[PDB]
C-alpha cells in the first residue's frame, strides 16, 4: 500500500504520529506474500522469519499491557537523565530518527520499567473482586 | 471440533451471529497440525501459510481498533448507497452468504473509513492526559 509510508519520516515526531497506521498496514506482506525446492526454499524461510518478527513485537506489547492501539500511556514516569529538552521541543523540532538515536542508551532501562504493569494487575485483582 | 461449524450458514445473519466462536475455534489447526524432504515439504509450507492468513486478519482488526471480541462497533456511519433494506430485513431474512455478495462492491471503501480510529486515538490522547 505504497500510497504513503515512510514519507512521514520527513517531518516531526508530532506530525508523524498522526499517520502511524500507514506503516503498520505495510508490515505483514512482502512481494512473496502477495503472489525443485532449490532456491524456492528461500521464499519459505523469509515468510517464516517475517512472521516471527511481527509476533515478537506484539508479545512485547502484550507483556507491557499495551496490546491494542497505536499509543499507550504507561504510568511510568520519564527520567530527567534520559533527555533534557522541553516536551514541545522534541515533538515540534525533532524527527523520530533523531529521537531514536538520542535515547538509544536507555532502551533496556525503559523497557525493564514497563514490567510495572504486572504489579498493577495484582493490585487490580485485589481491589476488583 | 466439528460438533458444529458452517451449519450456521443455513440460517439468517441474525441467528448465525450467536455462534461466531463456533467457526473461530476451527481456524488454526488442519489435520497436519494435530498429527526425505520430498513431498513432506508441502505440509511445512501449508502450516506456514495458514499462520500467515490468520495473522493478516488479526492485524487488520488491530488497525481498525477492533482487536478482541467478535463484534465491534466502529462509530463510522453506514452509507445509504451501500444497500436499501430495512435493518431488520437483512438481519431476519438474509443469510451471510447473500449479504456478502450484496455489498461486495464497497469492501475497500468501508475498510478505508475504518482508518478513522486513528483520528479517534489522537483525540483521546489530547483529552486524556
Amino acid at each position, epitope marked *: *500500500v505504497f*500510497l*504513503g509510508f515512510l*514519507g*512521514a519520516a*520527513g*517531518s516531526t515526531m508530532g*506530525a508523524a504520529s*498522526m*499517520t502511524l497506521t*500507514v506503516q503498520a498496514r505495510n508490515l505483514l506482506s512482502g512481494i512473496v506474500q502477495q503472489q525443485l525446492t532449490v532456491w524456492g526454499i528461500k521464499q519459505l524461510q523469509a515468510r517464516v522469519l517475517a512472521v516471527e518478527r511481527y509476533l515478537r513485537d506484539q508479545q512485547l506489547l502484550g507483556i507491557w499491557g499495551c496490546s491494542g492501539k497505536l499509543i499507550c500511556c504507561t504510568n511510568v514516569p520519564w527520567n530527567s537523565s534520559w533527555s533534557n529538552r522541553n516536551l514541545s521541543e522534541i515533538w515540534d523540532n525533532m524527527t523520530w530518527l533523531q529521537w531514536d538515536k538520542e535515547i538509544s542508551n536507555y532502551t533496556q532501562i525503559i523497557y525493564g520499567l514497563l514490567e510495572e504493569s504486572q504489579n498493577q494487575q495484582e493490585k487490580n485483582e485485589q481491589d476488583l473482586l | 471440533v466439528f460438533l458444529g461449524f458452517l451449519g450456521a450458514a443455513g440460517s439468517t445473519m441474525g441467528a448465525a451471529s450467536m455462534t461466531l466462536t463456533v467457526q473461530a475455534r476451527n481456524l488454526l489447526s488442519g489435520i497436519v497440525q494435530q498429527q526425505l524432504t520430498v513431498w513432506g515439504i508441502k505440509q511445512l509450507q501449508a502450516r506456514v501459510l495458514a499462520v500467515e492468513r490468520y495473522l493478516r486478519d488479526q492485524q487488520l482488526l488491530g488497525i481498525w481498533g477492533c482487536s478482541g471480541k467478535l463484534i465491534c462497533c466502529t462509530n463510522v456511519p453506514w452509507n445509504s448507497s451501500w444497500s436499501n433494506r430495512n435493518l431488520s430485513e437483512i438481519w431476519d431474512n438474509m443469510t451471510w452468504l447473500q449479504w456478502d455478495k450484496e455489498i461486495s462492491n464497497y469492501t*475497500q471503501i468501508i475498510y*478505508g473509513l475504518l*482508518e478513522e480510529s486513528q483520528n479517534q486515538q489522537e483525540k483521546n490522547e489530547q483529552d486524556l492526559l
Partner: antibody
Amino acid sequence: VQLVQSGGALVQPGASLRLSCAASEFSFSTHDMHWVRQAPGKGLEWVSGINIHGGTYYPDSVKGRFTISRDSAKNSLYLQMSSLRDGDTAVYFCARGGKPIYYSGGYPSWYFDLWGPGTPITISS
Amino acid sequence: DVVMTQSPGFRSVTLKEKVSITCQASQTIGTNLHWYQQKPGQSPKLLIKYSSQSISGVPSRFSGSGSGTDFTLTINSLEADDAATYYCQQTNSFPCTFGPGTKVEIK
C-alpha cells in the same frame, strides 16, 4: 466552489511578494493544497504544497526562496516569495489536490480537481 | 526526472471527426497519467485520471487509455466546444512533471 485569488502585481528584481488564496464554500483543513505557476508560453510548473497536517513539499527550483503556509481559521493560503527574478514571471495559481484512490496520510496525490482563476506577477526593471 | 512529450504539436481537425492525440514518457510511469485541458484566458481543467478513469463534469465523448510510456486521448465525435490545448501530467515520480501540450484547432 472556488479558489478566490488576489490581484496581480509588478515588482523589481530582488523584491519579495506575498500571494494568497481563499476557500469559497469549503474548508481548507480537509484538503492538500498546491501552488503552480504558468510562465508565458509554458505549462504548469509545480511550485509548492502543504498537506493537511501542515507538512510541506518544495521543488529545488524555488526551495529556499519560496515558503508555503496555511491558516485554516480564515480559510486562507499563502505563498511568500523572496528575491524574485525576471525568470519567475508567471501566472500563479492555487489548486485543490484531487482525491487519492486510497488513504495515504499527509502524502499528496499530485493532481488537481479544483483550479483558481490565476494571479500574474511581472518582475522587471 | 520524467520527461514528457506530446505529439502532434497541434492537430487540425474538423467537426464530428473522431480524433486523438498522444503522450509519451522517457521512463515508465505505470498508469499514473492524467489529462488536462486549457482554453485561452481560462484556468486548467482535469478530464481523465489514472489513464482511463472518468470524471463527473466531463462529457462521455472523452476517453483514453495507456500504460508504461505510451498514452492516448480521444474524442468520439469532436465538438466546437472542445477546442483547447490538451496536456498530460505524471504523478509516478517526484517532482511531478508535465508535457508541452497539444493544441487542437477546429474547422
